[PDB]
Design a protein around this nucleic acid. Structure first.
Ligand SMILES: [Mg+2]
Length: 196
RNA sequence: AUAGCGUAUAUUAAAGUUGUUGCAGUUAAAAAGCUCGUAGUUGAACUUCUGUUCAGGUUCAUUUCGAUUCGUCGUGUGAAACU
């Protein structure tokens, strides 16, 4: 539907499927009705995960308007499950973040809130992708020359949902951001006082 | 030392013997008996990171090319970084 979009002009074959696909789920499943009623879309981008295997395995990332970001996270799990079943493609939800300029300030009486800065915006997606579960440890490495590798620590109990998307994420990030992102699984680090 | 050479006095260096650079401070001189406290001096971390490609030189490297000589240029790569 052009309904579930903000620009409301024209959609792309991908964006279109996503629209009806969404409208589908709120009619089909009674539970996602409430949440999906709310959800609006900003834009959707498709990315090809090209591996040396000459295999074409694509997935698509969808930009949920910030207004519905709360809601999007509220049912995030179930939503992505159905969208992947109903589109046979890998699905990722992000927030539509607007980045502010560093030196291009123009409104004398306007300060650039850190909330919308490049470090913080680009760092956002990573949380968004692995979505269902947020990371435990994040790190940076400086290869001699000057590369920066982000080996990120992911929870063990989530090996399911995250192991698969794992390659897509890497590839979407390298495209949007510019950051190489390798992951590493570590058993969760429960630190409490076991007391028998 | 030598048509020059002593002497007296102030002053420079030796003086890291007045010290920003660059001193010392248990016992050699030197931490105050001890706390509060405005001047003064001193202050944590975040905000385009980054990538791709083109180009100009720069350098450096060279199982290497063309020129010249009593030591330079041009060409190619890679690389870095600049721009
Ligand atoms: Mg004498």
């Amino acid at each position: 539907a052009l309904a579930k979009f903000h620009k409301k002009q024209s959609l792309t074959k991908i964006e279109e499927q996503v629209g009806s696909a969404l409208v589908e789920l709120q009619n089909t499943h009674p539970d996602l009705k409430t949440s999906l009623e709310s959800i609006i879309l900003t834009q959707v981008k498709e990315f090809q995960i090209n591996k040396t295997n000459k295999k074409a395995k694509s997935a698509v990332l969808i930009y949920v308007h910030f207004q519905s970001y709360r809601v999007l996270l509220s049912a995030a799990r179930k939503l992505i499950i159905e969208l992947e079943k109903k589109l046979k493609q890998i699905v990722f939800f992000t927030a539509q973040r607007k980045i502010e300029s560093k030196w291009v300030k123009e409104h004398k009486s306007q300060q650039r809130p850190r909330s919308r800065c490049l470090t913080y915006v680009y760092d956002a997606l990573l949380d968004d992708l692995l979505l269902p579960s947020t990371l435990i440890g994040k790190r940076i490495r400086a290869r001699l020359d000057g590369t920066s590798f982000y080996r990120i620590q992911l929870d063990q109990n989530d090996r399911d949902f995250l192991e698969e998307k794992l390659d897509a994420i890497t590839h979407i990030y390298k495209t949007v951001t510019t950051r190489e992102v390798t992951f590493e699984f570590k058993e969760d680090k429960t630190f409490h006082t076991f007391k028998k």
